[PDB]
Write a protein that binds this ligand. Structure first.
Ligand SMILES: [Mn+2]
Ligand SMILES: [Mn+2]
Length: 554
């Protein structure tokens, strides 16, 4: 039926300047050596991406899909959602959000400037009055950093980002922001993945695994998910939104945004030239995350019915899915997963990599992470969330005139504090850098799900205990998979091996302790793994007074 995109031949041009690596990387050339391997995706590869995601979608639904969709609409109907005032929506605009073609930017929006408020007022009226004229969007290449993979062609091409003007983005929040805060939990409950901290995610997956008599689990991820979303998927998303109790003015704007923006529209490059036409999800609209997660859930739950998955417990984040279910024996499990994949392919969610049943929790990777196991000194098994450290380490080494990688370091330290690579490598490097700079007490930003939280490095012990438990400071015996992966990624990036990081951490620890105060607490808690004679760590009173509850929610 419909093509995901069509193209005029105009270039996807850069949105301003694209940074050069410099001949010296002074903050990370003591972390790793192979800086040649660290690269940033740019508009230069945007055309290769465009080719890869342009294809004809043919979508065939069935009675399982219809039954699931009915249950989801009924679940939606329990939600009451309100319009945000124009001013409320204005003040949720991030401080550096891309400015408007109409001579104002995020600063004016956040301060309720007269010019910006009046312009947005007219954008909203036009939404209530015109349910049809397509809204123009800008297309740009995502700039993000990876390590070269020769096994996969060297450098990945940049993702495509598609977004409307700042005035429209404010209007989207007026109509749909409150729905984004309520709909996913309402239709998915515990299956909604973007409500869990790493430790809570682990706990959820362990609980599901344990309650199967004979558990089987698998992961599923869709190839180029946004381009596989059909105009009919998007209209079905509106009908799920419309299932909630909404004032009529919201219903009118929701429909108008769907027909004029969400289902498709023309795309212009940063130079204003017409560039193509979109008939799929625009990654950049307010409903991208919620839409992906709900549509993924509809298709996946229906495909579970198609395939005969027994007693499925799901975890869905965007287009990432884990299903833990009752095994029917490996032979039927293999067939069922093929049925699952075939059904998802009919629903227009074809697989990136073919899914495979697994019977060991460590071997299932979803949303770029997996559960692993370490011991204490106790022999007591402790489970925690980890991931391949390759991309975390590459981003740790991106340094330009415009970009400092230190927030990146801190983010990984916070999210993956129990891991051996954070504890021995990133933590060691982080405190070493900040000590030599004498900036240990200068706050840094932790960035997660579009929010920024101010963090003082010297509070990391309390933050980590609050998020991960004191066990995060005493994991002893890591798993074979995890040791292999971490050693391999350090070799791949030219970083010192773990034994060298141990020697460095002994020195960092001694320096931290010698400074007394909070710094000494960092040394004793975060680097207890480094010394032969372990100190007995006790609960930190400050951790009880931390409300980190919004850090890993939307
Ligand atoms: Mn995907
Ligand atoms: Mn994915």
């Amino acid at each position: 039926s419909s093509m995901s995109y069509s193209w005029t031949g105009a270039l996807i041009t850069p949105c301003g300047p694209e940074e050069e690596k410099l001949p010296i990387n002074p903050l990370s050339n003591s972390l790793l050596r192979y800086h040649n391997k660290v690269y940033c995706t740019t508009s230069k590869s945007a055309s290769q991406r465009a080719k890869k995601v342009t294809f004809d979608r043919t979508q065939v639904l069935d009675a399982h899909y219809d039954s699931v969709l009915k249950d989801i609409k009924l679940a939606a109907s329990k939600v009451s959602a309100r319009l945000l005032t124009l001013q409320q929506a204005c003040q949720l605009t991030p401080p550096h959000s891309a400015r408007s073609k109409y001579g104002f930017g995020a600063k004016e929006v956040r301060s309720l400037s007269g010019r910006a408020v009046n312009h947005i007022k007219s954008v909203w009226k036009d939404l209530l009055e015109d349910p049809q004229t397509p809204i123009p969007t800008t297309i740009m290449a995502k700039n993000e950093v990876f390590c070269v993979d020769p096994a996969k062609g060297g450098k990945k091409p940049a993702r495509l980002i598609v977004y409307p003007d700042l005035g429209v983005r404010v209007c989207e929040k007026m109509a749909l922001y409150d729905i984004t805060q309520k709909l996913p939990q309402a239709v998915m409950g515990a299956s909604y993945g973007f409500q869990y901290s790493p430790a809570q995610r682990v706990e959820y997956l362990l609980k599901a695994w344990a309650e199967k008599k004979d558990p089987m689990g698998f992961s599923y991820d869709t190839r180029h998910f946004d381009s596989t979303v059909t105009e009919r998927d998007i209209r079905t998303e509106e009908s799920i939104y419309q299932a909630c109790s909404l004032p009529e003015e919201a219903r009118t704007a929701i429909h108008s945004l769907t027909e004029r923006l969400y289902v498709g529209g023309p795309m212009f490059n940063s130079k204003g030239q017409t560039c193509g036409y979109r008939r799929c999800r625009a990654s950049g609209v307010l409903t991208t995350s919620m839409g992906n997660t709900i549509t993924c859930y509809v298709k996946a739950l229906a495909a579970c019915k198609a395939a005969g998955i027994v007693a499925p417990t799901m975890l869905v984040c965007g287009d990432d899915l884990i299903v833990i279910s009752e095994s029917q024996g490996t032979e039927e499990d293999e067939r069922n997963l093929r049925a699952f994949t075939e059904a998802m392919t009919r629903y227009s969610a074809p697989p990136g990599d073919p899914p495979r049943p697994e019977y060991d929790l460590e071997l299932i990777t979803s949303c770029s992470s997996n559960v692993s196991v370490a011991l204490g000194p106790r022999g007591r098994r402790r489970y925690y969330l980890t991931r391949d450290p390759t991309t975390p380490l590459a981003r740790a080494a991106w340094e330009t005139v415009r970009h400092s990688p230190i927030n990146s370091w801190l983010g990984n330290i916070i999210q993956y504090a129990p891991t051996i690579w954070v504890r021995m490598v990133l933590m060691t490097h982080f405190f070493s850098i900040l000590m030599v700079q004498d900036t240990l007490d200068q706050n840094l930003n932790f960035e997660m799900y579009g929010s920024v939280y101010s963090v003082n490095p010297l509070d990391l012990p309390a933050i980590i205990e609050r998020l991960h438990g004191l066990d995060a400071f005493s994991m002893h015996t890591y798993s074979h998979h995890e040791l292999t992966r971490v050693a391999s990624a350090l070799r791949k990036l030219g970083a010192p091996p773990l034994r060298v990081w141990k020697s460095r951490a002994r020195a960092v620890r001694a320096s931290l302790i010698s400074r007394g105060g909070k710094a000494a607490v960092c040394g004793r808690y975060l680097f207890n793994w480094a010394v032969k004679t372990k100190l007995k760590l006790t609960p930190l009173p400050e951790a009880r007074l931390l409300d980190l509850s919004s850090w890993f929610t939307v």
